[PDB]
Design a protein around this ligand. Sequence first.
Ligand SMILES: Nc1ncnc2c1ncn2[C@@H]1O[C@H](COP(=O)(O)OP(=O)(O)O)[C@@H](O)[C@H]1O
Ligand SMILES: Nc1ncnc2c1ncn2[C@@H]1O[C@H](COP(=O)(O)OP(=O)(O)O)[C@@H](O)[C@H]1O
Ligand SMILES: [Mg+2]
Ligand SMILES: [Mg+2]
Ligand SMILES: [Mg+2]
Ligand SMILES: [Mg+2]
Lengths: 312, 295, 15
Amino acid sequence: NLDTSIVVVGSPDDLHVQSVTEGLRARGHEPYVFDTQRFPEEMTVSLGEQGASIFVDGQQIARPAAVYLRSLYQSPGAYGVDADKAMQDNWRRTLLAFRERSTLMSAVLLRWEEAGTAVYNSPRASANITKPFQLALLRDAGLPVPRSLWTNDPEAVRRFHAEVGDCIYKPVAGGARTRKLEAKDLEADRIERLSAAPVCFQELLTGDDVRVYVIDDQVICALRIVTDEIDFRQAEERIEAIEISDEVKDQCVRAAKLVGLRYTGMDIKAGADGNYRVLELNASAMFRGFEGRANVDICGPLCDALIAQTKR
Amino acid sequence: NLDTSIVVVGSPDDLHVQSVTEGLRARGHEPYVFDTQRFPEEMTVSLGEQGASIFVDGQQIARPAAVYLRSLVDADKAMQDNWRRTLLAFRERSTLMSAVLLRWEEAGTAVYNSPRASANITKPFQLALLRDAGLPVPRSLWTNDPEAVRRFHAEVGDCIYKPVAGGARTRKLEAKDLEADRIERLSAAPVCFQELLTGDDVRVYVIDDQVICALRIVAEERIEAIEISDEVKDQCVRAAKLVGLRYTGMDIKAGADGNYRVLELNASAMFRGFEGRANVDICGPLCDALIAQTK
Amino acid sequence: LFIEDLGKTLAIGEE
Ligand SMILES: Nc1ncnc2c1ncn2[C@@H]1O[C@H](COP(=O)(O)OP(=O)(O)O)[C@@H](O)[C@H]1O
Ligand SMILES: Nc1ncnc2c1ncn2[C@@H]1O[C@H](COP(=O)(O)OP(=O)(O)O)[C@@H](O)[C@H]1O
Ligand SMILES: [Mg+2]
Ligand SMILES: [Mg+2]
Ligand SMILES: [Mg+2]
Ligand SMILES: [Mg+2]
């Protein structure tokens, strides 16, 4: 009774869920918006022993043609989640509830992928997204990565800094900005805190940030980000589309297939030599900010890939 | 310095770690024990951008021949103070350890149950994967909808319900539960329902595409070895190959008609309490598969 | 924490 050939997994309040919904409408399809944050209270899910046996709020969704996975909202600290109240009051019960929800919703996504749904970014990619594994995999497939050290050992850090020179530190997984490794950070009272959690240290690449969008083994666009160091009081960011060689294009496509994504925003960064190193592949990349600042279209090509799947 | 050809991930105070360590010891191999509980505060791990730049406590461990992954804390105060910061820090630690295991597996290490298998272990998907592949499974219903339960009971007859996650006793669904007030508590508490199988439980151990033994179960439980069919032995090897486990303890349960259904595969099944009460040898063949991968 | 500003929203599945 409702068209589920294209499913968008995310909150309707998410701006990229909104963007893809508007694009899909403008192209004649209506997406089924699957909002996991309504699961227990305002939703109904039912799974049978057979893979095709999936029932959401009554209706059977055995196999969408394609799926856009914005988020399953698996932990209370996920992006579109507002869980600080429940976590403050009883963090154990809240974390358990989130884990239970995550199990079922993932089972749904993995079932769709098993029936043949083209899930734009399967959750199965997370194993390869693991950053200290991701960069090694990429490098061993022939993609340049920064000199890196993921560690909790202050000596390894001191020796790595001595081998490389100027360094940055950033999270192993995410959740903080990249900083420069200043001299204070190598002092004992600072560097000793690595005993709490490991940190990622890297050669300070001095060239420019580029964002390369890849959809279905085609580069949609490469956007270069430059920092306005002109006025020290209000530094802005300037994003502009650029041309890249076929070499860079094919390396980005190989990277996407290697990690295992269908829609990715590669973050790359150039060295002083002017050559790019791979910083990361994003499994749920955003595009609206870059779409606006660079005056390019990413939502369109994504919607067109999703629609192309329904004819496939 | 230490022999890194065979690695045992987990605390040395874990009883199965002790079993496997002594079992390897009595066979001629001293396993390196990767006590991950000492990771952040009392142990050093370092990863470089090259896959083989893996350094544990100063010593490089590039590619073990085999790894027995057993397991991978007190944070109540931290969680009450700032739960976002604490969750993120735990994610940092766990990401580094997962990256170690993944680099090893990609290098060629035979990891006995790789963490990648977790996606297939997802229960509401694991059972469907086993079903659509021709293996016998109980009729099931994961739900939070009272009507779906009322229809599932009316269809399969007597049924039981277990939790979505696990860690609670399987309970028989009676008609008292299906009444309005009683069942309405389900719309916020999803559970699994399954046709009640009246036959006996069997745990089948598979190690490298071979069934090691089968044990029937019935603080006083009786566990004794069973001879199961070559048909069922092949089915078990196939289920383990499909979920992606080099070593598993499969919980299966027979029905009234004498046909076993697969209940679950365990990604790190315990074997101490079984081997003892049944006078069978699980730790042995496991240590043997481990040492085999060294050749 | 070595990364002081960690917790202080740059959340998980943002990107
Ligand atoms: N090795 C590096 N050298 C210089 N800058 C870096 C380096 N690694 C990351 N950065 C900076 O950090 C920013 C974001 O880090 P990134 O690696 O993309 O992870 P995330 O976006 O998940 O934080 C990049 O835009 C870049 O400016
Ligand atoms: N369909 C079923 N009918 C009757 N009993 C069951 C059924 N499924 C599970 N059980 C009982 O529940 C016990 C544990 O369930 P199991 O599927 O092994 O998951 P877990 O061990 O993770 O809780 C089994 O030993 C079995 O006795
Ligand atoms: Mg980035
Ligand atoms: Mg069990
Ligand atoms: Mg279990
Ligand atoms: Mg990212």
